[model samples]
Target: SNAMKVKIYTRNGCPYCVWAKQWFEENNIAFDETIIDDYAQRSKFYDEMNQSGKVIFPISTVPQIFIDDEHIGGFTELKANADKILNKK
Candidate 1:
């Protein structure tokens, strides 16, 4: 009873973004994503991540991941907490 609804926000030429997607693939878990542009940054996800209001925070990075609508930060966070995030119980 631990199925997760995963989503990723990523862009082009980001190696870690692809890596994150690859990890999900190898793990055989389904995830949703959008290939967004870093320049045309209109995504409120980052704002939400940093608790900002329409203002771009300094250190907002790509591949913003969400598990069950919970913001799980970037790729590093995802990889580090893989076991706990997906407890295949």
Candidate 2:
């Protein structure tokens, strides 16, 4: 496991979220996942989004990720920056 404290905000039925979680696990990267599958938790999700200045989409693709309090954006960005985030570079 790495020293980076990774956080991922996710919801049920989101493919990207699943993939992101899977990737972290498969890579042995320790991370915290926050699930927001209901209305009550959505506000928390929105708060995170707003704090990061990220715009929500119609489909609301996630998991929105962070590395050590640094916003690392969504799945695509994660994939692109996996080496850096994983501290393998």
Candidate 3:
């Protein structure tokens, strides 16, 4: 289903970030991307990051993802639960 919005936090020179976008595209899942190349933007990201309770994940990891405003973590989680993430029936 297309009810959930897939938002990806990405940056240049990030491998998994690229792969995350790639996977979404290959799956025909539409997504929104926010590239955090600016350090100020990273602070902005941190603010939003903290918005989620106990948001535990490596800060250095690129391609932090969210679905319908819920933190979905990284590409690894993305790959693992994609079918569940998307809607069925």
What is candidate 1's TM-score against the reference?
Answer: 0.75
Off by over 4 Å in 3: 51-60, 87-89
TM-score of each: 0.75, 0.75, 0.76
Worst 10-residue stretch by lDDT in candidate 2?
Answer: 52-61
lDDT of 3 by residue, 1-89 (tens): 64568788888988999999988788777889988898787877677667756366645457888887777788898888778865531
For residues 19-89, could you state the per-residue lDDT of candidate 2 as single tens digits? 99989899988888988788667865676667665443322446788787777778898889987866651
The per-model lDDT (C-alpha) reads: 0.74, 0.76, 0.77
Clashing pairs in 1: none
Residue 69 Cα positional deviation in candidate 2, in Å, after optimal superposition? 0.3
Which should have the higher lDDT, number 2 or number 3?
3
* Candidate 2 segments exceeding 4 Å error: 51-60
Candidate 1 CA-lDDT value:
0.74
**Compared with the true structure, what per-residue lDDT tens digits does model 1 show for residues 38-87?**
55473565555566532233336787777876667678888888998768
RMSD of 3: 2.8
Cα lDDT, model 3, residue 58: 44
